[PDB]
Design an enzyme around this catalytic site. Structure first.
Site, mmCIF file in Angstrom:
data_model
loop_
_atom_site.group_PDB
_atom_site.id
_atom_site.type_symbol
_atom_site.label_atom_id
_atom_site.label_comp_id
_atom_site.label_asym_id
_atom_site.label_seq_id
_atom_site.Cartn_x
_atom_site.Cartn_y
_atom_site.Cartn_z
ATOM 1 N N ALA A 1 9.956 6.785 4.641
ATOM 2 C CA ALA A 1 11.329 6.479 5.109
ATOM 3 C C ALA A 1 11.279 5.688 6.427
ATOM 4 C CB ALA A 1 12.123 7.756 5.250
ATOM 5 N N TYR A 2 10.139 5.728 7.142
ATOM 6 C CA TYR A 2 9.884 5.106 8.479
ATOM 7 C C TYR A 2 9.694 3.582 8.372
ATOM 8 N N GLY A 3 9.328 3.101 7.175
ATOM 9 C CA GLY A 3 9.011 1.683 6.913
ATOM 10 C C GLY A 3 8.169 1.475 5.662
ATOM 11 N N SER A 4 7.719 0.232 5.494
ATOM 12 C CA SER A 4 6.868 -0.254 4.381
ATOM 13 C C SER A 4 5.538 -0.717 4.982
ATOM 14 C CB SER A 4 7.557 -1.382 3.668
ATOM 15 O OG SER A 4 8.804 -0.962 3.126
ATOM 16 N N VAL A 5 4.436 -0.567 4.245
ATOM 17 C CA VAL A 5 3.070 -0.968 4.701
ATOM 18 C C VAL A 5 2.428 -1.910 3.691
ATOM 19 C CG1 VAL A 5 0.819 -0.201 5.557
ATOM 20 C CG2 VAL A 5 2.877 1.203 5.879
ATOM 21 N N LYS B 1 2.686 -2.671 9.252
ATOM 22 C CA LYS B 1 3.841 -1.782 8.986
ATOM 23 C C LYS B 1 5.100 -2.496 9.465
ATOM 24 C CE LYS B 1 4.485 2.141 11.266
ATOM 25 N NZ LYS B 1 4.148 3.552 11.654
ATOM 26 N N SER C 1 5.126 3.198 1.301
ATOM 27 C CA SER C 1 6.396 3.192 2.067
ATOM 28 C C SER C 1 7.001 4.598 2.096
ATOM 29 C CB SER C 1 7.358 2.179 1.497
ATOM 30 O OG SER C 1 7.336 2.197 0.079
ATOM 31 N N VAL D 1 0.857 -1.214 0.000
ATOM 32 C CA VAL D 1 0.000 0.000 0.000
ATOM 33 C C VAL D 1 0.887 1.256 0.000
ATOM 34 C CG1 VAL D 1 -1.399 1.331 1.640
ATOM 35 C CG2 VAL D 1 -2.173 -0.913 0.809
ATOM 36 N N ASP E 1 -1.111 9.206 13.235
ATOM 37 C CA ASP E 1 0.228 9.744 12.844
ATOM 38 C C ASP E 1 0.681 10.847 13.805
ATOM 39 O OD1 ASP E 1 0.344 7.932 10.726
ATOM 40 O OD2 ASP E 1 0.506 9.543 9.184
HETATM 41 MG MG LIG Z 1 0.418 11.227 7.923
#
Ligand SMILES: [Mg+2]
Ligand SMILES: CCc1cc2c(=O)[nH]cnc2s1
Ligand SMILES: [Cl-]
Ligand SMILES: [Cl-]
Ligand SMILES: [Cl-]
Ligand SMILES: [Cl-]
Ligand SMILES: [Cl-]
Length: 348
Positions: free
Chosen positions: A30-34, A49, A28, A26, A164
């Site tokens: 810089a914090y991770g991939s979803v 995530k 990505s 869905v 978030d």
């Molecule tokens: Mg946001």
């Protein structure tokens, strides 16, 4: 311990419990991939995530611990909650990867404020839910720091969740120029003239409420200085009483170089809006931060008479953030995180 299975999705290895099926990417940052998935235990469609480089530095290891602590605490109808957290590791010694599981969110406010018609009754209900969630967040002495339309999920029934939270992650480049990342920020934290306080979040709610009423960004500045000029034209330049409290010598110096301006007439800016909506905007968009309405006080305003129930506006359990002032090594932040993963209890 559940059984885990492995798959490669867009160049990334995903090792997850058998309960999670039909994984599909869905996005990505810089914090991770979803990935979206179907959770066979609960029947929910979920977001999974995988954090990227969670323990790469002291700053990154502490940020991982901070995010997990905050998501494990939040238990409120108008705030995103944690459905699950897991690692494939069988011990601290092999621990590297962290996965976070939430309800899959479809539309954000952006999608419905750009591309749909909002009655006054829709604005009442949406702003009510943001304030109900913020009363809960602020009662735990948490500051969100990044409220804006893309951080508000909304369903077909106009039901809203805050997501978030600000992890203190936004960079200088991200805040530069004609960008929505800055248009909702309070003026006292725009150029770091004051330390963050829960009162900055009420400024953001005022900017969101104005945009739902007009269909237009309230302060769409082309840069920090342009944005401050649009703000002072509406709310006025700082008066004798507020000038006394401006402790930043940089702020007094630039601010005193501008010609004085009076506060504008909000009934002439928000033409045709509910008079009770105009009154509440005048109480949120106050340049003097300590004079702004609080979330708890705003829930009792007459604009929300249809929805306000003082027996159904809950506060949070106490939240210990003493770790924020603590100096630890990478492996100590990593052990604290590991303990929080293994002690997770799922919601009823
Ligand atoms: Mg946001
Ligand atoms: C011009 C923006 C500011 C508001 C404010 C306040 O409420 N207290 C102290 N300094 C400032 S600067
Ligand atoms: Cl399983
Ligand atoms: Cl949730
Ligand atoms: Cl691992
Ligand atoms: Cl946004
Ligand atoms: Cl706590």
């Amino acid at each position: 311990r559940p059984t885990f299975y492995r798959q490669e999705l867009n160049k990334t290895i995903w090792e997850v419990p058998e309960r999670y099926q039909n994984l599909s990417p869905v996005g990505s940052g810089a914090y991770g991939s979803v990935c979206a998935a179907f959770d066979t235990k609960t029947g929910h469609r979920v977001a999974v995530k995988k954090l990227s480089r969670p323990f790469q530095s002291i700053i990154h290891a502490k940020r991982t611990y901070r995010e997990l602590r905050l998501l494990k605490h939040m238990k409120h109808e108008n705030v995103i909650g944690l459905l699950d957290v897991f690692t494939p590791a069988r011990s601290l010694e092999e621990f590297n990867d962290v996965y976070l599981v939430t309800h899959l969110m479809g539309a954000d406010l952006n999608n419905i404020v750009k591309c749909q018609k909002l009655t006054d009754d829709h604005v009442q209900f949406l702003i009510y839910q943001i304030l109900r969630g913020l009363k809960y967040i602020h009662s735990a002495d948490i500051i969100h720091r990044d409220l804006k339309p893309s951080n508000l999920a909304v369903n077909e029934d106009c039901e809203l969740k805050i997501l978030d939270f600000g992890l203190a992650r936004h960079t200088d480049d991200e805040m530069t120029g004609y960008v929505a990342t800055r248009w909702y920020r309070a003026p006292e934290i725009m150029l770091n003239w004051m330390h963050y306080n829960q009162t900055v979040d009420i400024w953001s709610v005022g900017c969101i409420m104005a945009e739902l009423l007009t269909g237009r960004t309230l302060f769409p500045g082309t840069d920090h200085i342009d944005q401050l000029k649009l703000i002072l034209r509406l709310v006025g330049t700082p008066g004798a009483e507020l000038l006394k409290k401006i402790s930043s010598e940089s702020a007094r110096n630039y601010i005193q170089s501008l010609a004085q301006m009076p506060k504008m007439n909000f009934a002439n800016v928000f033409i045709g809006a509910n008079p009770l909506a105009v009154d509440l905007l005048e109480k949120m968009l106050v340049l003097d931060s300590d004079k702004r309405i609080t979330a708890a006080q705003a829930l009792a305003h007459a604009y929300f008479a249809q929805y306000h129930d003082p027996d159904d506006e809950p506060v949070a359990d106490p939240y210990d953030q003493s770790f924020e002032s603590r100096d630890l090594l990478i492996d100590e932040w990593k052990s604290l995180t590991y303990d929080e993963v293994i002690s997770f209890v799922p919601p009823p």
